[PDB]
Amino acid sequence: DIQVQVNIDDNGKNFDYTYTVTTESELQKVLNELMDYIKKQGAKRVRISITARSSKEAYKFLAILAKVFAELGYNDINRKMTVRFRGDDLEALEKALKEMIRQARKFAGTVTYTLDGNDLEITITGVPRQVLEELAKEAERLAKEFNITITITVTVEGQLGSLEHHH
């Protein structure tokens, strides 16, 4: 249901792990554990990905990543989104692609994509949080219009910021 992937770069070494969880509450408990660790041990850089089933959750997950970095005094240095569609009608899949990437380029975003069999993957970078929220809306919209399943991954990468900026 909900998948959260964490990369912690503690320079010279590197740690990756993933939990799958079913509620927002279990999600929060993973993030709390990670905040405690960061507060107490630090890191050169941290990357967090959360995979939603809907645009409402994606919106919520982006707001949750924001509080996480705020609390840590981390600067949001990097954000992206991966939409994954899956379908049997190739033609429907290719229509979803055509429109998904038009919209993203319309908001000055850069896209990357791969189509393989039933699975279709689109990564969007270089746009502010506000846009990724819209493009999630659009993605869910398109998934419904073409009757294809959909995944939404929001990804944030940050590092510890200035004392002055946190204040």
SS3 readout for the chain: CEEEEEEEECCCCEEEEEEEECCHHHHHHHHHHHHHHHHHHCCCEEEEEEEECCHHHHHHHHHHHHHHHHHHCEEEEEEEEEEEEECCCHHHHHHHHHHHHHHHHHCCCEEEEEEECCEEEEEEECCCHHHHHHHHHHHHHHHHHCCCEEEEEEEEEEEECCHHHHC
Give me the CATH number covering residue 86: 3.30.70.600
Sort strands 2-9 and 74-86 into parallel, antiparallel or unpaired. unpaired
What phi and psi, each to the nearest 5 degrees, are found at residue 68?
-60, -55
Total structural domains within the chain: 1
In the numeric block, which tokens belong to residue 112?
Answer: 């990357």
CB of 133 closer than 8 Å to CB of 62: yes
C-alpha span between 160 and 148 (Å, rounded): 39
Deposited experimental method: X-ray
Residues 6+ apart with CB under 8 A from 16: 5, 6, 7, 8
Resolution in A: 2.5
Structural domain span for residue 92: 1-167
List, as own/partner pairs, every contact residues 161-165 make where C-beta atoms lie below 8 angstroms and the sequence separation is at least 24, other chains included: 161/73, 161/74, 161/75, 163/73, 165/73, 165/75
Q: What region does 119 belong to: left with phi over 0, alpha with psi -120 to 50, or beta?
A: beta
C-alpha span between 62 and 133 (Å, rounded): 8
